[PDB]
Design a protein around this ligand. Structure first.
Ligand code: SF4
Ligand code: SF4
Ligand code: FES
Ligand code: FES
Ligand SMILES: [Fe+3]
Ligand SMILES: [Fe+3]
Lengths: 633, 633
């Protein structure tokens, strides 16, 4: 089981699944091997009914697609389509929040409201929207109108790109025609250009991909901003993670997926439904989190995290999960089958995201609280059905400190310098206490033993004094292995990083250091690390491609992660990916994405499947940036 | 060579290619076999880095994707993505025309103008735009603003759907939530819902696909309307087709691709550049057409058609093609390689559609005429370089009567009944002279011997008195085998159809019948047959799914053809596809698309690879509609 996951509770549940004959993601992976080399390398195209076209990586024919598409064209077109799909996911998340805010301030969804008015004012000022003498409701109405308008062509380019990156960075990208014209415009234009008999030049295609990745960034940043306006900006919180956060004696309700719009309401309504759950004979309603929706309610409300990503099925294997409430993205459709063996009620709520065999509750913001009650009532019923059943929850959980938004980080730092809060952090970079900054992002991938790359690379970087922040299921992997527990700072962090974490935490009324890794939220909250990095850039006078900041999608799975890696490259970062992406069938494209892109954006991909090597390479990139600033290392 | 193409000039040029060692689409196809069964059946998914996932059509494992995606989910998601790519192509075509019209009437692109003011007024009235007391330039400005606005969410659904279908049809589609909210909105939402861990219900996914296909329809209809405003509505014209339209003694310039925006300017400017071409020693500039751009200038200006689709390379094999001017869509990137053997200058003109090895001319509407001169000058130079070279143009050409827009058809019919022009046509349906109507649409596919399905099915339907109309490369296939030559009416058409064609043509000052097949334009001008069918629906009081109208993508290749077949099904038509689409790996999805979709839209797919069988099935569907109206058959 140790080749499947490094998580001990996941191993316990894999044993139970094998005992009980429940098929798992790892079993389906085992039945899939050997996987196809054409697809694995990118050398396969189906954008034509003349296809499929396979191109051998090496040897004799076939050497070219039927229409004459070369290997680099096929590879570049495939990658471009996956960037557009990732952009479309983060896009739809943010679009739906934009509609929710619009509905809220127009009196149509009373379950929603402006919870963060300082943020609303910040965003409106950054966008050039006038605040002075305006009603909050009208400022928010303008901010939502701008959000929706960034999806199409207009007078201006995408404001959630051009107003969130330092002007020098915007000038670099715009001299290469990389500034998106509208989010959905870019997605559709990718789909156009990559269809048969269109763009057939790898450089041209990859430039389009960089532009589309920035559309994805805009969607992430939009979603973050709007969820913060709607639901509050995260501040540091203490909670727990892993399967042991489940309780045999409560109604256990997992919120799963990505959009917090419904699950924040679920969190707030379950509090009221406590008394009714307890009339059914439960101790209460125990809302836990899975994947990014879970991270949203962990960041804002301290909801404990049950599990993430490749291991989501294992929550159900305990027999104590009574409801799994989905919205969309990264939900294994297998849950709906597995529920028939475990008694969990799987509930979808989004019209475009349904799974055959799952109960559907048609969620509308205009009836949010009503929907919530209905859904939790189903959960309560399911708990009744397992009154006295034996459950096996592994008694494994870690302590998690999280809620480190960029605003929270800046406030924490301001306790060391109120008038120039980024300065303490910059000072410790300059004197070597902080070697650089590494963002861990992305998901788990069944091909990599779960969390192994995240934890190995993290361990090496922390010993070398790299400040580590994390999002999405990368945050999830690090939190389930103790990396967000301050009590591990001694074992994990080199002396200088230890000193800075201790200084900031003791200055923040915690009596202890900050945790070894700063949890910055969901996959859309990858934009938060942009806002931090951008701010450092601005405070220092230099473009992003000169900062000792790096990013690692250590176990990337989802098309969203490919779009995110591509916009970490486009805004200027060295960007490790720890899973093989479908680029190795073409040397020209690999060369562009790992080398010559440096001469356009300053970022570049680092493709490295071995995590010790990947950590060396990330440390080398950080130290190259240090030397470029004239710093020691 | 006869198993490759049924076109005699294509066979001559295949012989020359084999002689001279030039690789062709058919050779690359031969090197591709045996093709992959997973892709061919749809049972393959790469929307995850955990992939590729192959699912055996039959047998043991693998039976499910790694994430638990079933076979019908994988198949439905693949098909949905190809509908969105087709929609994105027709979408971008129409978007670019919308921007061109906007630029024209704002004084920014003087090479463009309102050429059809009657059409502009029609469109503005159909859209609810006010015409009375308005400047043309301001009406057109409103019409372009509405065009651009149909790409995103707004007060209203997509007007190029809801104002072009009969209200009963709009009510049917809207009771199923199939009315698109914005063209690019639908494309992005498909990309969202089909990415990993989202929609996992085949019915839900296929309903999304129908909605996206209607976005594609909107894009087609928009593109038609705007090109008609900008460039004139086609009226009947006489021209020629096939390779013999090339002339050894002229500068031979092929316009190739889909957007007429540049090639109409090329047509008009080459007239002036005649004298300069003839100073180089040519007889003149001979502009010929390939694929849909060619069909646009054939429809409007009588430009002769050289070739289409699977056989486009053969134009270059003559050695007499001096320039091939591309915009985008269905251009085999092989042209750019083959040009090095044939001396043709391949010129791309669109920023998102470049081919490695081709000269790029950056075309801007604001400098259209200038760009044209530059491009034709390159053509002229290339002609000089082959002064005295031997060329082999096959002396094979057919006579083509074309330009049968819906307006042209209605005018022609109005010579038999001025006050009720659809009535003569309806009368002859009712008395059996016209059995029904069949639209041939789509491309050629290297798997089908070129034009064989189009010509076989056409022959059978014409003998049974079916009125046949055609677009795109289906129009191309029928025109190159004589089906748009009135002199073949006797050999081709049954007695009643012959009588109606003779009556209309002799009433239209032609002294002969109309041609056996009505050429209605490009792939976007598939919308023209909608406008005709809709009008018949409205004139008769019945929904489209009650008319004896059918559609056949007899040799479909491009993702655009899949979107077109899907919106011919969604607006209510029996819709034959003559190439295997990637649906056979899932019986549920095949059942939905060929049977149970009848109970939603009234249309259905007819998948039939044998053309004699396909013609039987199309005749049976037409006669089923006849019986449903209570007619004889
Ligand atoms: S677009 Fe080209 S490479 Fe792709 S399937 Fe079609 S013929 Fe093959
Ligand atoms: S989305 Fe599912 S079926 Fe598709 S590649 Fe990923 S794991 Fe396999
Ligand atoms: S041949 Fe395996 S990915 Fe297509
Ligand atoms: S396995 Fe051949 S299409 Fe993927
Ligand atoms: Fe996840
Ligand atoms: Fe074509």
């Amino acid at each position: 089981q140790n080749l499947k996951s490094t998580d001990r509770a996941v191993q316990q549940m894999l044993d139970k699944a094998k005992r009980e004959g429940i098929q798992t993601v790892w079993d389906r992976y085992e039945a899939m091997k050997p996987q196809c080399g054409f697809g694995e390398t990118g050398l396969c195209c189906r954008h034509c009914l003349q296809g499929p076209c396979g191109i051998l990586p090496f040897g004799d024919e076939p050497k070219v697609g039927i229409c004459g598409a070369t290997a680099e064209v096929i590879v570049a077109r495939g990658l471009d389509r996956s960037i557009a799909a990732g952009a479309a996911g983060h896009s739809g998340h943010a679009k739906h929040l934009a509609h929710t805010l619009k509905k809220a301030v127009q009196g149509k969804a009373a379950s929603y409201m402006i919870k963060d008015r300082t943020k609303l004012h910040s965003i409106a000022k950054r966008l050039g929207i006038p605040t002075e003498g305006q009603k909050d409701e009208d400022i928010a109405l303008e901010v939502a109108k701008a959000a929706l308008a960034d999806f199409h062509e207009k007078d201006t380019p995408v404001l959630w790109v051009t107003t969130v990156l330092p002007p020098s960075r915007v000038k670099v990208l715009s001299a290469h025609g990389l500034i998106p014209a509208g989010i959905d415009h870019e997605i559709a234009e990718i789909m156009h250009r990559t269809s048969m008999g269109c763009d057939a030049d790898a450089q041209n295609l990859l430039l389009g991909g960089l532009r589309c990745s920035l559309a994805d960034l805009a969607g992430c940043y939009m979603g973050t901003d709007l969820a913060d306006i709607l639901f509050g900006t995260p501040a540091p919180v203490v909670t727990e993670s892993n399967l042991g956060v489940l309780k045999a004696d409560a109604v256990n309700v997992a919120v799963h997926g990505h959009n917090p719009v419904l699950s924040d309401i679920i969190v707030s309504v379950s509090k009221e439904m406590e008394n009714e759950a307890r009339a059914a004979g439960a101790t209460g309603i125990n809302v836990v989190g899975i994947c990014c929706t879970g991270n949203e309610v962990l960041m804002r409300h301290g909801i404990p995290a049950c599990t993430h990503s490749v291991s989501q099925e294992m929550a159900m294997i305990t027999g104590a999960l009574d409801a799994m409430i989905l919205d969309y993205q990264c939900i294994q459709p297998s849950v709906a089958t597995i529920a028939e063996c475990t008694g969990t009620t799987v509930i979808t709520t989004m019209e475009m995201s349904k799974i055959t065999g799952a109960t559907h509750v048609n969620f509308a913001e205009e009836a949010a609280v009503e929907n919530a009650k209905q859904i939790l009532r189903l959960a309560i019923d399911t708990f009744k059905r397992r009154k006295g059943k034996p459950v096996e929850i592994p008694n494994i959980k870690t302590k998690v400190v999280a809620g480190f938004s960029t605003e929270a980080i800046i406030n924490a730092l301001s306790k060391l310098n109120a008038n120039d809060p980024l300065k303490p952090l910059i000072d410790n970079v300059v004197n070597g206490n902080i070697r650089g900054v590494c963002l861990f992002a992305g998901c788990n991938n069944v091909k990599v033993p779960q969390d192994q790359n995240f934890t190995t690379i993290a361990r090496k970087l922390l010993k070398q004094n790299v400040l580590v922040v994390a999002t999405g299921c990368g945050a999830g992997a690090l939190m389930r292995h103790g990396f967000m527990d301050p009590a591990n700072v001694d074992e994990l962090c080199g002396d200088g990083l230890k000193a800075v974490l201790t200084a900031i935490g003791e200055a923040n009324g915690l009596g202890g250091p900050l945790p070894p890794v700063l949890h910055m939220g969901s996959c859309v909250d990858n934009s938060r690390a942009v806002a931090l990095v951008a701010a450092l850039a601005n405070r220092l006078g230099v473009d992003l491609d000169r900062l000792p900041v790096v990013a690692s999608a250590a176990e990337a799975m989802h098309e969203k992660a490919v779009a995110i890696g591509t916009w970490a490259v486009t805004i200027g970062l060295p960007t490790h990916i720890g899973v093989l992406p479908p680029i190795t069938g073409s040397l020209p494209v690999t060369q562009i994405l790992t080398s010559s892109v440096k001469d356009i954006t300053g970022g570049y991909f680092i493709v490295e499947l071995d995590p010790e090597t990947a950590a060396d390479k990330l440390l080398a990139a950080i130290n190259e940036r240090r030397a470029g600033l004239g710093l020691p290392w």
